[PDB]
Design a binder for this molecule. Structure first.
Ligand SMILES: C[C@@H](Nc1nc(N)nc(-c2ccc(C[C@H](N)C(=O)O)cc2)n1)c1ccc2ccccc2c1
Ligand SMILES: [Fe+3]
Length: 280
């Protein structure tokens, strides 16, 4: 039989660790509970609760934003660079202001039909990919601990807003993402793992070749000052994106990646994934 999967957008309704650097910080710990409760209480159709971020949270965002913006012009793909200024104009991307999930959700709705729902923390690859099928991106709302703004193994709102949002605003990329989600719905465990891995080494950590140069489109790179620099250093190993090979690569979840895969274009990666999903 087929495992349960969402058939409508509202069906997504039905889908701190003590060693976290911020656990021993009382305000960090308490605010994380606050963010977790907002996500848990959320139901499809609700406006995403807007949060008044603290000075410390804004300072961390500010550091991340300031340094990443120095790198984007030379490191990010053109699609990313095309869309970032629109977000800054319409959604309040500033060094001293954290954009709200509700604002970026509404921006994406009008651009590509993408929307956001808040998530408390970890969700399964199956669940996350299932959201993409409805052009729904599950986003965290909290900010990374101040101790390391340059890289965190835990995705935070900086990652969602600076890593993902500017590309979700691009029609070709939104289509590519949705198609992974669609392929995942009710798929076998093996199929989901393979799809999740291809997602990881494209949407999350992908590089592309644009006018002969390597650029990054991977959200996990676009939100990490240190890994973004590392990816294009270039002391990093690079391979051509090839789903039948890429899907077998181990996804590293507490370190920099060991390898980055290069796609020719969003359209090309989409086509390769189309051919690949037929085989699984
Ligand atoms: C196990 C891990 N899986 C996972 N899958 C994908 N596709 N991307 C990521 C991911 C994790 C961290 C980051 C942040 C990035 N390194 C940065 O420093 O900006 C960006 C992406 N993790 C994960 C996922 C969600 C979590 C939510 C809360 C806490 C831990 C999580 C771990
Ligand atoms: Fe991500």
């Amino acid at each position: 039989s087929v495992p349960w999967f969402p058939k409508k957008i509202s069906d997504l309704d039905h889908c701190l660790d003590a060693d976290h650097p911020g656990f021993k910080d009382n305000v960090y710990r308490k605010r994380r509970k606050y963010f977790a409760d907002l996500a848990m209480n959320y139901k499809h159709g609700d406006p995403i609760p807007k949060v008044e971020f603290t000075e410390e949270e804004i300072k961390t965002w500010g550091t991340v934003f300031r340094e990443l913006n120095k790198l984007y012009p030379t490191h990010a793909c053109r699609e990313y660079l095309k869309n970032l200024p629109l977000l800054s104009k319409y959604c309040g991307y500033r060094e001293d202001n954290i954009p709200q999930l509700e604002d970026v959700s509404n921006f994406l709705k009008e651009r590509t039909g993408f929307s956001i729902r808040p998530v408390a923390g970890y969700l399964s690859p199956r669940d996350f990919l299932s959201g993409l099928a409805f052009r729904v991106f599950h986003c965290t709302q909290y900010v990374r601990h101040s101790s390391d703004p340059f890289y965190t193994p835990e995705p935070d709102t900086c990652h969602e807003l600076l890593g993902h949002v500017p590309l979700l605003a691009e029609p070709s990329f939104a289509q590519f993402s949705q198609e992974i989600g669609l392929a995942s719905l009710g798929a076998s465990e093996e199929a989901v793992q393979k799809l999740a891995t291809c997602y990881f080494f494209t949407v999350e950590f992908g590089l592309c070749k644009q006018d002969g140069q390597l650029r990054v489109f991977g959200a996990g790179l676009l939100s990490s000052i240190s890994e973004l620099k590392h990816a294009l250093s270039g002391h990093a190993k690079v391979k051509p994106f090839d789903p039948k090979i890429t899907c077998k690569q181990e996804c590293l979840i507490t370190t920099f990646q060991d390898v980055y895969f290069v796609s020719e274009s969003f359209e090309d990666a989409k086509e390769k994934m189309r051919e690949f999903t037929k085989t699984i």
